[PDB]
Amino acid sequence: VESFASMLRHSPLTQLGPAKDKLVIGRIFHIVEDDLYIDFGGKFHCVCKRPDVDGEKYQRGTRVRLRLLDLELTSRFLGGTTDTTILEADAVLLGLQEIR
Amino acid sequence: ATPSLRGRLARFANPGKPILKPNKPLILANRVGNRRREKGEATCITEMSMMMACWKQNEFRDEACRKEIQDFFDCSSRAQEARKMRSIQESLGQSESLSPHKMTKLLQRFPNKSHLI
Amino acid sequence: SNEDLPVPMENPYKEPLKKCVLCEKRVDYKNVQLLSQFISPFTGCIYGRHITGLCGKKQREITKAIKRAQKMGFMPVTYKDPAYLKDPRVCNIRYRE
Amino acid sequence: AGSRLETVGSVFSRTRDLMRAGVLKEKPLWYDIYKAFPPLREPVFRRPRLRYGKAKADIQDIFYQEDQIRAKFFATYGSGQKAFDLFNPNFKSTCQRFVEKYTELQNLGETDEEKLFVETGKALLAEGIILRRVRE
Amino acid sequence: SRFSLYPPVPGQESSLQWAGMKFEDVPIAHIKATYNNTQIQVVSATNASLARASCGTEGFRNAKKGTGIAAQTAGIAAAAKATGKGVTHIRVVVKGMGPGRWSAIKGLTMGGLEVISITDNTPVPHXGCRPRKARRL
Amino acid sequence: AKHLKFIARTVMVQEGNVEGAYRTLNRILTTDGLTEVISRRRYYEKPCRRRQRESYETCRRIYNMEMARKINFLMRKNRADPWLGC
Amino acid sequence: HFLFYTGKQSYYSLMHDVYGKVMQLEKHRAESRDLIGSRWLIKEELEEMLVEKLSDEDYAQFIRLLEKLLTLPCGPAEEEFVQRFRRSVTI
RNA sequence: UUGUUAGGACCUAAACUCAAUAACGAAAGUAAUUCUAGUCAUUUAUAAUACACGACAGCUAAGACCCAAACUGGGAUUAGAUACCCCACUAUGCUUAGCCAUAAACCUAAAUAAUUAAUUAACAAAACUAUUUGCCAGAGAACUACUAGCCAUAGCUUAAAACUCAAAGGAC
Ligand code: FES
Ligand SMILES: [K+]
Ligand SMILES: [Mg+2]
Ligand SMILES: [Mg+2]
Ligand SMILES: [Mg+2]
Ligand SMILES: [Mg+2]
Ligand SMILES: [Mg+2]
Ligand SMILES: [Mg+2]
Ligand SMILES: [Mg+2]
Ligand SMILES: [Mg+2]
Ligand SMILES: [Mg+2]
Ligand SMILES: [Mg+2]
Ligand SMILES: [Mg+2]
Ligand SMILES: [Mg+2]
């Protein structure tokens, strides 16, 4: 049985390295009006806006392309003892993935 | 970039004399202040002066200043609708930004904690 | 024990530190063209480090050079020389709306 | 009648005490289960405190040896134009193939990092992968 | 191919002329706007007096002498004397930060003078004379 | 006094928008801090009072600027409720 | 009832059903005015159906969830469901 | 008198912006420019009856004087107004020597070396160990009386008792 240490070393997330300005594939699982909730394989989903072009194409289950920025949006503020987190990830929707 | 707060307050770490002496603790509150009311500016002030200017020459006789009197009504008639239309729509929409009440409720969904959980 | 355990080391991906627009350059009082890029075109006032974007060290070098140049008959005090009104803009500021 | 003091002892110790006291006449149903299969740590209250002075945490930064190679690859070529798929458990990215080849050459005995980086680029070029040396 | 807020540079060649006059030649309107009285003087580019006015000379007195409408009247009066003397374009150097700082320039516009530029010469000492003590209220 | 006249604090009127020229002139003097300087030079501020004021303004700027960050940091999470009804 | 410890087992049991209906309509994918001259039941009427007491905030949330159901594509089962909470206005 | 002066003289006084900076100095204090002189190694803590300093105000002699300004005079306000507001003007703030040695001289937190768990009287700027010196022992009487020292003479440091009370005080 593979060890947890081995699993982590060869994990896709460990291979990604820093997540800033990386390209990843996500999946839309929830849509509220023109807001798309996209799972890109991380801890937290991201929330993007439906593009004007090919808006109807972005339906639930649609795999898309993204440019990650943060896996979790967090920041300590003046007088805080802990980082405030919004339980959300940061990414830029680039467009649909070609099925090919 | 927020100013530096290192070596400003009077503390047992700081070797030198303090720079900043805050009246109140420097901890972000979970509310925003109530924005103080803003008032507008006089509308049709120029057109009123023109009307009044003509009267002075013509002994306050409306016969001479018939055209100017109609311009004063025109500006007031436009502004009358403008104040009506803008209060009904723009103020209700609050589209551009949040109000103090709406902002504070969002600041309370992710509140600042100066104490350990 | 385990070959796959992580190895202590310094961060390989650590990002480089940002430098100021005058990092490792010589600020001279006689270079009035460069000094004029950090004053106001209308009043000639020195900009603060939240406008020039300089570090503490280079901000003080520019301040000490503008005053020396202004005091030694090289630079005007109440405005920016009209010659340098066309030079590159390196200060975050907009008088016009 | 109970022990609503959750900062002294634990639910098990306070339940043990209430039975010794004489107030609780019937064992709770969860009691014997805890006695036979207790948790690893006793659930006792501890007030969180800040660290002060030179006290520091004990968390190891996770850096494998491949990161030295991966850091150079991202700085020289950026992220592979092919998009990462983090849903496939066995996904092989353009960078991970670079690191697999760089390791293979290093096993042969090449000792110069410059030699291993330009040779690996040539091998992937033969494979047909499109590596763009984007300084931008 | 755009307008320049910055004034022409003295000692250079420019294409900007007003009424067949260069920038250095256009007469200057000196407005001293204080917190009590707003004075106005118009001079030729050789520093020769052409018009003079102020809220006081118009006839305002005490607290009325320091209102916006009082300076507006003074500017219109200064324009009339200057317009008679042969002045159509003025360079407005407005000293002072009082109530009739803008009103005096607005009166000059109402009086038939064409402002081509606005300078500010409010005294700003660089360290100078100790000001009078703060008033308690 | 020894400098050249009409270069400093001078604006040019564009197509007869004298009010715009005045409004730009004031924006310059306010942005450059001359307005506050002349305002505070009417009377004398005592050295202890000046230091108390600068400490106050710096602490306010620090608070206001940081408060803006939290507002902008949470601006994105203000969206339609995805989990309405639960 | 599995929601006994909520304190409003019947209000939350109803809000559980309507939220599950909404999810299937949203996952699975015409004019919505199938019924006209009707009103949503008042809080007093809802309280009687649930045989429990509600707050004004509890009523307001229930209506918003029911409206969202109407917005979405509705099979005849949903139309019968929302009908239960629509009272024919005796204009 | 006033406004303008790309006119002349003066070099009195004070140092905008930079400074959203936080450096230097034992403290007091110190930020216009230039140059000269210049801070530096005692293991560390610990000192008076000695030595050297010490904001502001004040004193002595001679100068300076733009502006500010106790006092004083005039105007107003008020029942009165020895005030708050307005005007004028002096001691004084400046320089050269000497004196005086006091501040909420307080960052109300002595200095030094640690420690951050075995740890909330309240509030403030988290708790706490060791070392050495100084200081405190209910409030008022009392920054007083007397004594001695001092360039100080309506002064500074040093500093009681009688007598009175059953509280005073701190935080909430
Ligand atoms: S950041 Fe290097 S000198 Fe400014
Ligand atoms: K203090
Ligand atoms: Mg306080
Ligand atoms: Mg004169
Ligand atoms: Mg002169
Ligand atoms: Mg030297
Ligand atoms: Mg009197
Ligand atoms: Mg004198
Ligand atoms: Mg003296
Ligand atoms: Mg003392
Ligand atoms: Mg002090
Ligand atoms: Mg005393
Ligand atoms: Mg005494
Ligand atoms: Mg004595």
DSSP string, chain G: -TTGGGS-HHHHHHHHHHHHHHHHHHHH-----SS-SEEEPPHHHHHHHHTS---HHHHHHHHHHHHHHHHS---HHHHHHHHHTEEE---
8 Å CB contact between C94 and F32: no
b/e per residue D106-135 (b: at least 16 CB within 10 A): eeeeeeeeeebbebbbeebeeeeeebeeee
The whole-angstrom separation of Cα A8 and Cα A19 is: 16
* Sign, Cα dihedral of B96, B102, B107, B109: negative
How far in angstroms lies nucleotide H19's C1' from the CA of residue D135?
Answer: 40
**C8 beta carbon < 7 A from strand H?**
no
Chains in contact with chain F (at least 3 beta-carbon pairs closer than 8 A): A, B, C, E, G
Q: Which atom of ligand 1 is nearest to the CA of C19?
A: 1
| The two structure tokens encoding residue E13 | 């060649």
Strand pairing partners for A85? A74
The two beta strands, E28-33 and E89-95, are parallel
Q: How many residues does chain D have?
A: 136
Q: Is the CB of residue E38 inside 7 Å of nucleic acid strand H?
A: no
| Residue B4 CB in 7 A reach of strand H | yes
CA distance E42 to E69: 20
CB-ligand 1 contact for C25 (6 Å cutoff): no
Q: E47, E48, E27, E29: which is closest to E39 by C-alpha?
A: E29
Question: In chain D, which residues are last before a break of more than 2.5 Å from C to the next N?
Answer: none
Place of tokens 């005015």: G33
CA quadruple F70, F71, F77, F81: dihedral positive or negative? positive
- Distance between CA F42 and CA F37 in Å, rounded? 9
Classified as helix, coil or strand, D51 is: coil
CA distance A9 to A14: 6
Specify the length of chain F in residues.
86
- Are β-strands A84-85 and A46-49 bridged in parallel, bridged antiparallel, or unpaired? unpaired
Q: Which two tokens stand for residue F27?
A: 């924006």
Strand order across the beta sheet in which A63-70 lies: A46-49, A35-39, A22-32, A63-70, A90-96
E39 beta partners:
E32, E54
Residue G89 buriedness (CB in 10 A; 0-12 / 13-18 / 19+) = exposed
Contact of E117 with E93, CB cutoff 8 Å: no
CA–CA distance from E116 to each of C16, C52, C66, E80, E86 (Å)?
51, 32, 32, 18, 16
The reply to whether the CB atom of residue F8 sits less than 7 A from any atom in nucleic acid chain H is: no
Q: Contact B117/D48, CB-based, under 8 Å?
A: yes
**Chain C, nearest residue to A8 by Cα:** C4
Nucleotides of chain H touched by protein CB (<7 A): 2-6, 13-25, 28-29, 32-34, 66-69, 84-86, 93, 107-109, 115-117, 119-120, 124-127
G28 Cβ contact list (under 8 Å, min separation 6): G73
Distance between CA atoms of D99 and D84, rounded to whole angstroms?
Answer: 16
Handedness of CA B61, B66, B68, B74 (dihedral sign): positive
What technique solved it? cryo-EM
- Interatomic CA distance for residues D60 and C6, integer angstroms: 8
The single-letter code of the amino acid at D41 is R
Check if C80 has its Cβ closer than 6 Å to any atom of ligand 1. Answer: no
Q: Enumerate chain B positions whose Cβ falls within 8 A of a Cβ in A.
A: 2, 5, 25-28, 110, 112-117
Task: Round to whole Å and give the CA distance between D134 and B105.
Answer: 46
Ligand minimally distant from the alpha carbon of residue E32: 4
CB distance C58 to ligand 1 below 6 Å: yes
- Residue pointed to by tokens 């200017």: B53
